[PDB]
Design a protein around this ligand. Sequence first.
Ligand SMILES: [Mg+2]
Ligand SMILES: [Mg+2]
Ligand SMILES: [Mg+2]
Ligand SMILES: [Zn+2]
Ligand SMILES: [Zn+2]
Ligand SMILES: [Zn+2]
Lengths: 97, 290, 55, 50, 145, 55, 56
Amino acid sequence: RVALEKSVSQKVAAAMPVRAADKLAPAQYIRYTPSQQGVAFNSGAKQRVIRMVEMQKDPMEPPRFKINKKIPRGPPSPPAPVMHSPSRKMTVKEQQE
Amino acid sequence: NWEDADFPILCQTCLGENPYIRMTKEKYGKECKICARPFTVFRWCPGVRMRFKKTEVCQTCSKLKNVCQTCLLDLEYGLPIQVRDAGLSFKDDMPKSDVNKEYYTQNMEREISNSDGTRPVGMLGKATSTSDMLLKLARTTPYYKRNRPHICSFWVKGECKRGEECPYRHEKPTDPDDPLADQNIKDRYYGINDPVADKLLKRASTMPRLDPPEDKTITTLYVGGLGDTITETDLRNHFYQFGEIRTITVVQRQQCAFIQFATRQAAEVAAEKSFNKLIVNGRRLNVKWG
Amino acid sequence: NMLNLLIHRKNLNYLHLDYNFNLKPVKTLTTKERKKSRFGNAFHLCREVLRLTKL
Amino acid sequence: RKRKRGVDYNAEIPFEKKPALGFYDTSEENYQALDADFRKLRQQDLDGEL
Amino acid sequence: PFRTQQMAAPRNMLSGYAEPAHINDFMFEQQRRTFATYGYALDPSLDNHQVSAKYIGSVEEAEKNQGLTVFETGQKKTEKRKKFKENDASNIDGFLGPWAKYVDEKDVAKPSEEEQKELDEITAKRQKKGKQEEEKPGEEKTILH
Amino acid sequence: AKTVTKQRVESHFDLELRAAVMHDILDMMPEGIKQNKARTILQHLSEAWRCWKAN
Amino acid sequence: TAARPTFEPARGGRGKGEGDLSQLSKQYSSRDLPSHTKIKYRQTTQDAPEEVRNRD
RNA sequence: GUGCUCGCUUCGGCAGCACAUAUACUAAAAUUGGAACGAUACAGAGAAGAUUAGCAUGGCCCCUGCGCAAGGAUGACACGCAAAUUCGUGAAGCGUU
RNA sequence: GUAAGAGCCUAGCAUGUAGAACUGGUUACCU
Ligand SMILES: [Mg+2]
Ligand SMILES: [Mg+2]
Ligand SMILES: [Mg+2]
Ligand SMILES: [Zn+2]
Ligand SMILES: [Zn+2]
Ligand SMILES: [Zn+2]
């Protein structure tokens, strides 16, 4: 139920897109290890800390990109083995009837 | 589908020379320069006199081809994709025509989002077998001339009214009568007719390399720069890898060691492994034919 | 400005919104141009509300 | 040429599925292409007799 | 031996390991402006050798200026640039309070005497590719067969 | 997903009846029958309804 | 020809709520407005599941 | 920059301290490609004779509409040598074992 | 006898991109 309600909220957010229009400043930190070490890269360091602020959205701005573009259905997931029985033998008489 | 993944996939010559970065995250900011689907654009400034670089391609289009999202160079080596596929195979064959491209992108996006989220989904097994010529021209230290503000086009008309305050460079642009000037995004990304990669391959082809055994069945190796500080007991300990080793003549006066193997295939394999690579006891051992 | 940026984004250069929010065709339209340039109650409600406020 | 699709047919393989691979090495072998013979060949000759 | 530098590193998504930190804002931006102003800062890596405290940058200027930050009173104080001043706001078309340009450096920067001609040449090189002018070739061509 | 309002009612009934008959003949045939012949049985259903209306 | 039956229906999963909510469209109908935003539950006299559990 | 400095100490300069602490999709651009439903020529409404109401079906076709209404020629497209696994009888003539 | 293919013709709406890879070489024995 906790997993479902989140997806519900993300769907329902379209139904009222702008009622008390949104707020965004949880500016957060992330520690990152370049996996490139051999140092001439940070300056001599092994990690780097990055402060992420989310870009502030314009209230008065329409959707940006074309979404109506339409493409055919991709391949389905790999076929399952069919697991039937040996198969009943069929007669000429019943095949004709 | 949208892309929407946190914290981009970046190299170290674009992420900056400062270990303290402030970047902004825009949720569906631009469209991808390849995929043409919208993705999460991250904008940071590397250093002080830099350009505010941003990611150009999707997380997905970098997971396909193991590249950085803004320089479009290999995360491990720092080279164009045509050079790395030259030093590998080319079995991806990403479509370039329209409907095929969006169809392939949809299916590979389902493939990646039906997996872990850590490996270069097709490039992994071929990325095991590496260390071709690309390692001998891999860039050692970052080229921070990439992160650099463009030529002031008002200064080209001699009319830059900002003068000393303009954050764009007042220096010469490159002569357009140059192969190293055209450089489309998709040409750099698919590995097709990239002139930077052409010049890197022309340099790596004229890199010094093995010669064949000119006369038949001769396995004789002519070792110059042998050195008088090393021992022949370590030579066999390095050399029993290849096969049935025959006699090893040693001349420590000209610093030349003569080597014979069973088959000429083993001598060619030793030529492959040894030439211009092998440094034992911290001292370069040169091997030649004749 | 909003209403005729909506007009000019739809490439309807043969319509003209005057300064009192009257929408008139500049020329005599074909059937295809007339079907392309039919607006709905949203556009005309906003246009007539703006007519009342400009009065 | 002004159309969205359509040039995708000769340029590459249209909605290409690679054959699923396994248990037998299928990388060395390859097929020999068609002899052109562009001095006898007819549109009727490729499609065959209806 | 069947893994590379990227494949042997403890990575989380294709280029390394990324984990949420909780550094204090002031100290973070302090070391950030310390590197952006002078060229050195303390190391935010959490092990790297597990001994005391190393500086990561242009470490030669770090000991020269004692390892100071931007929030602290500096050692050097010399060679100030000279600017105009008219803080009165009483003379019209003479006031420039904080909009005071320096006395030495000035506005529009033409490149040079030769650089302009070279840029004219490079625009002319661009012009020959656009191409649009084509005279009707009346050049005569004859001889005696 | 267009709604079945008033002008789609009879067409949708005939669209769904035909699908029900498709399912029933796929399940009614025994194990080794050639799995063609759906179209012919649907033609017979159309004919039986026209003979029903024709008495 | 033009007049023809179906013999295959349309498959769901490729539009407006199907995979990424049509990549998060800002289009919504009047019928998609907030309405009946509170589930009623069965009370003690109605047929609450505690009342229905002990019963023979 | 301002102020306090029982700072040198004049009303000039300097010293210390306090407060104040990191804008910018960085352009007045250079470029770079794609579109319109208008003319201009050819062209002319689906249902086995003709004249025709329509309602659907399917998706790498969309348009007007706020529309899960409704229209767009029933909006258009759909017209196909429509061949998918898998064979056998009987008699006669000729050559062969 | 239509305002649509087709099909031509001329058109103009979006971008402010990513990128520039450039250096090394010796010779010698017995019949
Ligand atoms: Mg209709
Ligand atoms: Mg009709
Ligand atoms: Mg229809
Ligand atoms: Zn992409
Ligand atoms: Zn990069
Ligand atoms: Zn400038």
